[PDB]
Amino acid sequence: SSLLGSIAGVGWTAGLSSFAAIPFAQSIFYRLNGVGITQQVLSENQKLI
Amino acid sequence: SSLLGSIAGVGWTAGLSSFAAIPFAQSIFYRLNGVGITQQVLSENQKLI
């Protein structure tokens, strides 16, 4: 459960592990921005995803 | 022992292996600059580390 807590902030990264507290939604817009390399205009318009 | 020799220069990298001869101190300031992503102003001021 602390691992699920660290999913969002640790999934950022920028180093394992010296971080963070970022909401989970923004963690999946950066995790989604990363390798599904759709940048910000698609995740802005739209979500729902 | 040749592996300990190649720790410094090979730990640079920029390719394995076609390199190098860099002193070990600067190898740990770049290895330390990398993932403990503290950039140059901290390792300058200070060392001791």
B38 chain-A contacts, CB cut-off 8 A: none
A15 chain-B contacts, CB cut-off 8 A: 35-37
Separation of CA B49 from chain center? 14
Method underlying the structure:
cryo-EM
d(CA B34, CA B20): 18
Residue of chain A minimizing CA distance to B37: A15
- What tokens appear for B12 in the block? 């640079």
CB contact under 8 A, B36 and A15: yes
d(CA A15, CA B46): 21
- Of A17, A30, B36, the C-alpha closest to A3 is A17
What resolution in angstroms, rounded to 1 decimal? Answer: 3.7
Whether residue B39 lies within 8 A of chain A, CB to CB, comes out as no
d(CA A43, CA A19): 24
